[PDB]
């Protein structure tokens, strides 16, 4: 059995990982040895104890990565490195990983000797897991891109911040509310005079989520006006899709709302060619074992395509799917999955697996 | 003065309308009459009463409208028939009214003899009060559209759901948060298992709102697959400005968020020709004296282009403009307005301040 080191396992990433790992029992297939950055198990930093490793899985973050796979790399280990983070996705000996919809690309890269696998952007595997099978017949021109993204994906006290926003939103009106004959103008006042006052918590997001909306997620790359975040869409999307010499445009707004783990996103997809709604639907379905095609009904789609919903569950559900006024050729789409599992924990998880067996 | 008549003016529209014509003291040029059907002024349903009217203003809704509105126009009645709700938006001796931007339909309106302006969809008044300028030098092939839709356009009673279920969700793990150390993931489970639970408030909007979103609003039309909410985009912004004829392309998916009274939407707009993201900034900014520009920076989106912000206010933001990959005649744009102010009652109190002239 292949010996495996975990870093940053007890994180928020992490410990999804874990959960999830004990759920499937992929502990009984390898050998762990666990890490940490604390001096009160190894030390994360302890480049020669990680050399002895044949595997080594991190949740800790980009700048444990960038300080310590250098300094390992260059002992000479010959092992694989897998990351949730993004420091290395980009690199020439990297692959992104998502193997429900870029297993050829990483079988090829195993029998090429890539030793470097690295779990994608959120968004992005959320929108392959969807709409896979578009991509996978080579009828995507281009994508349009809007998102309603969740707090988990900035972070656990993010989640926190969120929470107590919502808290202090109520509560500012919490009489009022009861009282089935008050002023519904008036308890707006107020509620919005909070949301805007001094000791409303804001710290994490630097403005408010909680009954608001943040159009902006990420380092602006004054290069092209995108956001790091946005930018990732036409960047990751292509790689994973191996498909960097002629990249399908993808591109939009992330916009961050207050929901705690799942994306959601709205799609206007561009299809080379027209093909009738029902043709579609079974194209994206038949894709693989976890999207799920809603029909264009209200209860249902007020019961299936929900944070609520999905929250929690591998489920990745894809609706409201029809034709769009720009003609036939144009696809609506809108879909939501969870943001710690395909979108964090999931693809890594897999990719070890593999990796193991 | 002409004399006038209000009906639905104890309503959320209606209230706002009166603050706002209070505000600008537009009952010092009118002859006010307001009416009611409770059997607790005259009576909304005293058809000879409103006879005696110049002109009548409705925010009482669709049915009041459908009832009362054929009865007086068929008793002869030459008096302007004002309407907030969208009965007779469509009709081909009405006009959908947004004076900033169709003035010149209006103008012609009037003198042609149309005695029935209502006023419009708030999703496409606050999208036209945002990107006027475009459309004015007939620069807009087609718009897709992804929006952020505040509680206040479904009612004054799914604000307050909206609100109790942020309450339920923090009291949920209210003590959790004050912990410095808790678990995150705990955390979410319980706020996620009271969403889910029997007790939680949705009988308003049928599903959860709180922490979550509703990517579906209003009745499904079996022709396109749209809602009425979404079909409100292609037909609604073109009979605005006088285009029925050759009708502009908007489509998209209008999607329900946990906001109190700002839409937000975000545009993927198809310009007919390629200008510097420059010469687009001040088209859009000239147009006129509400929306506003936000440069594409951080802080400054934080600050402006949100619900928090613009709640309550005249001040249509739009921010995040850029090119969009799909080539240089592709542009991307954000907005934020207030539902309630621009998307209901301004212009209606706008038409009404013309009409008494």
Chains 1, 2 share one sequence.
């Not at 990297?94 to 079988?107: K, W």
């Not at 988990?152 to 969120?162: C, I, Q, T």
Request: charge should be negative; charged fraction near 25%.
């Amino acid at each position: 059995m292949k010996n495996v080191g975990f870093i940053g396992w007890r994180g928020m990433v992490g410990s999804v990982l874990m959960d999830r790992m004990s759920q499937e029992n992929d502990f009984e297939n390898l050998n762990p040895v666990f890490f940490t950055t604390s001096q009160a198990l190894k030390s994360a930093f302890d480049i020669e104890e990680l050399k002895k490793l044949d595997i080594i899985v991190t949740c800790q973050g980009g700048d444990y990565t960038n300080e310590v796979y250098p300094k390992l790399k260059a002992t000479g280990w010959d092992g694989y490195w897998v990351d949730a983070a993004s420091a290395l996705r980009m690199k020439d000996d990297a692959i992104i990983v998502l193997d429900p919809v870029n297993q050829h690309v990483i079988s090829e890269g195993l029998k090429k000797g890539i030793k470097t696998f690295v779990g994608g952007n959120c968004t992005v595997s959320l929108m392959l897991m969807a709409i896979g099978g578009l991509f996978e017949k080579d009828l995507v021109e281009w994508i349009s891109v809007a998102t309603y993204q969740a707090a988990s994906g900035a972070g656990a006290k993010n989640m926190r911040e969120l929470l107590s926003q919502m808290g202090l939103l109520e509560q500012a009106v919490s009489s009022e509310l009861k009282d089935p004959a008050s002023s519904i103008l008036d308890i707006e006042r107020k509620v919005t005079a909070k949301m805007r006052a001094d000791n409303f918590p804001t710290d994490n997001f630097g403005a408010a989520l909680g009954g608001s909306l943040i159009p902006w997620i990420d380092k602006l790359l004054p290069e092209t006006g995108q956001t790091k975040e946005e930018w990732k869409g036409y960047a990751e999307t292509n790689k994973i899709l191996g498909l960097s010499d002629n990249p399908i445009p993808v591109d939009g707004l992330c916009v961050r709302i207050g929901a705690l783990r799942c994306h959601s996103q709205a799609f206007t997809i561009k299809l080379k060619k027209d093909l009738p709604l029902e043709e579609i639907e079974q194209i994206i379905a038949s894709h693989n074992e976890w999207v799920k095609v809603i029909p264009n009904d209200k209860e249902i789609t007020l019961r299936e395509l929900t944070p609520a919903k999905v929250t929690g569950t591998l489920s990745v559900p894809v609706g409201r799917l029809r034709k769009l006024a720009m003609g036939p050729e144009y696809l609506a789409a809108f879909t939501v999955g969870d943001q710690l599992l395909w979108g964090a924990a999931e693809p890594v998880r897999r990719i070890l697996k593999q990796l193991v067996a």
